[PDB]
RNA sequence: AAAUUGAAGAGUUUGAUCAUGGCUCAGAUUGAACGCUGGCGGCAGGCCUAACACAUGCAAGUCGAACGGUAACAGGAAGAAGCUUGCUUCUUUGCUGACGAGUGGCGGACGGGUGAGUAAUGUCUGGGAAACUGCCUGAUGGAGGGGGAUAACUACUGGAAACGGUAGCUAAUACCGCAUAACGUCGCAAGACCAAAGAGGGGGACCUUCGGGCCUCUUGCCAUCGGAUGUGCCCAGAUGGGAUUAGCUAGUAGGUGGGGUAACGGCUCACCUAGGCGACGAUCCCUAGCUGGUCUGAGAGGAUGACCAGCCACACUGGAACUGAGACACGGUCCAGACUCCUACGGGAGGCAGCAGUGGGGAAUAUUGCACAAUGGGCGCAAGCCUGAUGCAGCCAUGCCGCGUGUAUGAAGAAGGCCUUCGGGUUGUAAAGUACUUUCAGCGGGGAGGAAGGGAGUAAAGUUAAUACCUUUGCUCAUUGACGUUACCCGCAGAAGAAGCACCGGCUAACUCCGUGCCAGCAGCCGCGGUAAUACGGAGGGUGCAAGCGUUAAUCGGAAUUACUGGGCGUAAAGCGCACGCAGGCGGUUUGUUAAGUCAGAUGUGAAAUCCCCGGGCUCAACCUGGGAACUGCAUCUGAUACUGG
């Protein structure tokens, strides 16, 4: 129901914060080629149950700091 | 506040008003929330000269949109006609 | 000022500033008293200042300079400080 | 805003009769319309692909008495409208007030019809119109005004419009000097010596 | 720049105000512009009958 | 029923041909300039450069139904003082008309102008919570009781002026504390705290200090929660070039606590962690307001931001803050710098990138014009005032559209000119002559529409004690236009007052002589002139356009010549000298699962404007307008599972 975005994590070397990467599959407006574009975001991962590589799911709630407005919901793909 | 008023969009010596709901702090023919009918003082016979939307006018006056002088003098004519 | 309206409005504004400066400084001093009592570490002295600063920080909200949200935030912060003291 | 000069040099240049004369005098007796005008009409020059299209468009323009800008506007309207572009252009050209009144027979020539239209003698649907380019709609009522019904040239044109061809899309009556535009003329109804494709090819550039 | 005077006869000399338009001369290297006659000081060609507008010549009576 | 009506090549490498490829040309458009010419009307446009500085006039004022009062007028309401039986004086103006200045609140943050800066803090599309809101409006409560002054005014007094100072006089919707006040604030609760302004028309009795008390109507005053508008903030995707700009960032990334904003947030502070951005272009340089839109293009695309409309930024330059709900404010404040101006030398005044207009720049961009009569704004309950926005007038052919500059006859094929083979033809029905019209320009009359509103009375309804006073509904007389010698119609007479420009060797529609002789000169290309020039200048003739014609500057097409639609790499330009390989690109075959892309349907939005389709109004058109379609996009929901993807 609530608009949520699933993406792979990049870094977790921050207090209560991680860096997620989203791979949106879009088509080139000119050549019609289907490429992938990064959508790197900073997520306020309270109680960081996340490492590197595992995919997570985030939702936008409100601006929590200067450069993040997203919060974690669930962790799927946790096994490495 | 929101006000029902006119907006000239015709030509020189041939006016044609588009009755619209617009904020008071706006130009005569600038930005308006919605368009409600029209008016033509030089409209010939056997043709529409006023097509006000009384339903929308009532809806806006229920929310507090004030009606200007000419549109107030035209809504009564519309009610008298039909 | 060229226009008479602007010429009189400048005098109006400077007189309003002169009047409001004293009123703002008064409540600033009263809030400073509460903060000093809080940092002192006395619950009784903190409340004895809070219960009299509250009327002067609430009467101006529906009077001008300060706002309801600002008054509520200041009152909540001071109440939290009093509660956490000692 | 109209041609003011010889009415037979254009016909000689085009090579055929442009109907710019009333018809009382024979076209061959009126002028030596066999060759192009000027001092070099004896030679027969081989006309190019652009040349034939330009000559056709100029012939149509001079026959209908319009200018280049008005002809371009009419072509744009024909292309905008649905159906055959050339047929629509021909119908629009033969829909002007001067053209329709000439076809009815109130004017000797195109110039005479245009002058009658301009001088406030033609009335359409009981309304005074002095526009030579005034388009006429189906089921209209063109009529000579009461003041101009007693014109010697008008009645001469009325009596001289009979011995020539008669359009089958107009309802004319000289007793009251009035006519009705029953329906839009067709390509077969109009002249068959005009190449429609040349004009559209020329204007496709 | 270096312009090219058109026609025959030009009273212009040093310290003369002229008007310059585009258009070069094919058979002259370096020139890329043309002095337009009938300008502030560039007088038109005398006794001109054809294409008088291109050389700034008053219409004869 | 319609929003699909869409695709042109040519010249030039060579003794000759093909292909590649370069240049140029035909077409359309502009905020256009230049040269020649030039009649009218309608609709639009008119500093693209010096955001160069400004003489001068006007652009934001109004409210006495808030208050003290009367400095000009009038009724001199009005007792009125020596009343010339209208003459003068205090005045009465918390009596009525009204009123310069003053206090108070409202408006100045709207309207108007510009694109310097900003390549992202800006703009467009789609979402979100963490907040405000004068004026508009709904619901529920209340307006009880007093103070201290202050401007005006008055006596001085410094300065040339800007401007001030000194002691009282005094007002209120200016200010403040009491008391009441929760669905308001704080607080887990208990509990603690926060507001006020009165005015206007009347009225019998009850009434009176003889000013009045009291009832109703009218508008305000407050506290809370709502509706609309305006907003402030965040995220996602897009928004010029340069890599001959490759590392940048230490309040910088995050965290704890405090402070701050109406609101979330390193917005800020103290501490701790060493992180964050970056070949999906970080950082830096130049350029540039963005969008709907406009031109061109069949389409995809390219260029562009003229007018109008939505947003942002700016107001001599820079910094700052206050009043104000709303500004870090064009005609508000303070300070620093330049400029200009007055001076008694001590000291002061101003910011046209507003309407006009001035001085310079330029190739060029308008009159120091009328009116609030309408549409709106600001003030006022109203009447009423302001409004260089707006409605309009003036100039310019700057663009589009329409009309005219006569028509039907008219072969003695008049005269003259042009060439000629001297017999001829061309100008040419062209001209002259005859007949017939008067559109447009001029004169004289008639004459709509843009006018709905407002005041004064009258009948009815809502009101109360009331036939007073108010509001509303109909009725009758007053009324109102700058445009405006309006659009338009009618009579006068006369064919008058009304046509020029470019080109003519091929591209491209148009040929013959005269004057020179690679000289004079033409030119976008091919190229011409050395005595036969259809290419130079003129003449005759012809072609195109038309109140316009050509040149110039820019854009798109042709250019399939940046090719995603739509190219090539053996020899014209194009396979790295070869191999390995990271990121990346793609990927054999079957099943099940997911449904991210993809496919179907629905919802919201994709502003208005503009294009297109069907109709209407301007006598046609330009132009305006109603509806439809379209806005090719995005987000969400419900399904389909063949393909790609997990
Ligand atoms: Mg024209
Ligand atoms: Mg067609
Ligand atoms: Mg050759
Ligand atoms: Mg400018
Ligand atoms: Mg500019
Ligand atoms: Mg300036
Ligand atoms: Mg004025
Ligand atoms: Mg201001
Ligand atoms: Mg700029
Ligand atoms: Mg008050
Ligand atoms: Mg109280
Ligand atoms: Mg009180
Ligand atoms: Mg914090
Ligand atoms: Mg193309
Ligand atoms: Mg702009
Ligand atoms: Mg100014
Ligand atoms: Mg100006
Ligand atoms: Mg100059
Ligand atoms: Mg007005
Ligand atoms: Mg004034
Ligand atoms: Mg002769
Ligand atoms: Mg009228
Ligand atoms: Mg040539
Ligand atoms: Mg191309
Ligand atoms: Mg190729
Ligand atoms: Mg090679
Ligand atoms: Mg080679
Ligand atoms: Mg090799
Ligand atoms: Mg190598
Ligand atoms: Mg899916
Ligand atoms: Mg879909
Ligand atoms: Mg019509
Ligand atoms: Mg739209
Ligand atoms: Mg699969």
Curated annotation (Swiss-Prot), chain A:
Entry annotated with the keyword rRNA-binding: yes
Gene3D superfamilies: Nucleic acid-binding proteins
One Gene Ontology MF term: small ribosomal subunit rRNA binding
Annotated keywords: Antibiotic resistance, Ribonucleoprotein, Ribosomal protein, RNA-binding, rRNA-binding
CDD domains: Ribosomal_uS17
Any one GO CC term of the record: cytoplasm
Entry's Gene Ontology BP terms: cytoplasmic translation; response to antibiotic; ribosomal small subunit assembly
The UniProt record lists the keyword Magnesium: no
PROSITE patterns, per database record: RIBOSOMAL_S17
Entry function: One of the primary rRNA binding proteins, it binds specifically to the 5'-end of 16S ribosomal RNA. Also plays a role in translational accuracy; neamine-resistant ribosomes show reduced neamine-induced misreading in vitro.
Entry's family note: Belongs to the universal ribosomal protein uS17 family.
Subunit record text: Part of the 30S ribosomal subunit.
HAMAP family in the cross-refs: Ribosomal_uS17_B (MF_01345_B)
Miscellaneous comment in the UniProt entry for this protein: The strain missing both S17 and L29 grows very slowly and has a rather unstable temperature-sensitive phenotype.
Protein name: Small ribosomal subunit protein uS17
Species this protein is from: Escherichia coli (strain K12)
From Swiss-Prot, chain B:
PROSITE patterns recorded: RIBOSOMAL_S16 (PS00732)
Keywords: Endonuclease, Hydrolase, Nuclease, Ribonucleoprotein, Ribosomal protein
BP terms from Gene Ontology: cytoplasmic translation; ribosomal small subunit assembly
Listed GO MF terms: DNA endonuclease activity; four-way junction DNA binding; structural constituent of ribosome
GO cellular component, one term: cytoplasm
Entry keyword Ribonucleoprotein: yes
Induction: Part of the rpsP-rimM-trmD-rplS operon.
Pfam annotation, one family: Ribosomal_S16
HAMAP family in the record: Ribosomal_bS16
Family indicated by similarity: Belongs to the bacterial ribosomal protein bS16 family.
Quaternary assembly: Part of the 30S ribosomal subunit.
General function of this protein: In addition to being a ribosomal protein, S16 also has a cation-dependent endonuclease activity. In-frame fusions with the ribosome maturation factor rimM suppress mutations in the latter (probably due to increased rimM expression) and are found in translationally active 70S ribosomes.
Name of the featured protein: Small ribosomal subunit protein bS16
Swiss-Prot record, chain C:
Region (Disordered): 1-25
Gene Ontology biological process: cytoplasmic translation; ribosomal small subunit assembly
Cellular component, GO, one term: cytoplasm
GO molecular function per UniProt: ornithine decarboxylase inhibitor activity; small ribosomal subunit rRNA binding; structural constituent of ribosome
Parts forming coiled coils: none
Keywords: Ribonucleoprotein, Ribosomal protein, RNA-binding, rRNA-binding
Keyword Ribonucleoprotein attached: yes
Similarity comment text for this entry: Belongs to the bacterial ribosomal protein bS20 family.
Oligomer and partners: Part of the 30S ribosomal subunit.
HAMAP family associated with the record: Ribosomal_bS20 (MF_00500)
UniProt function note: Binds directly to 16S ribosomal RNA.
Protein name in the entry: Small ribosomal subunit protein bS20
Curated annotation (Swiss-Prot), chain E:
Record-listed N6-acetyllysine modification sites: 46
Consequence of substituting residue 26 to Q: Confers low-level resistance to streptomycin and a 15% decrease in the translational elongation rate
Superkingdom of the organism of origin: Bacteria
PTM sites of type 3-methylthioaspartic acid: 27
Similarity comment: Belongs to the universal ribosomal protein uS12 family.
Task performed by this protein: With S4 and S5 plays an important role in translational accuracy.
Assembly description: Part of the 30S ribosomal subunit. Contacts proteins S8 and S17. Interacts with ArfA. May interact with IF1 in the 30S initiation complex.
Further information: At least 19 substitutions or deletions in 11 codons can promote streptomycin resistance, dependence or pseudodependence; all but one of the streptomycin resistant mutations (K42R) are associated with hyperaccurate translation and thus reduced translational efficiency.
Protein name: Small ribosomal subunit protein uS12
Organism: Escherichia coli (strain K12)
Lineage: Bacteria, Pseudomonadati, Pseudomonadota, Gammaproteobacteria, Enterobacterales
Gene name, Swiss-Prot/TrEMBL: rpsL
Span within the parent record: 63 to 123 of 124
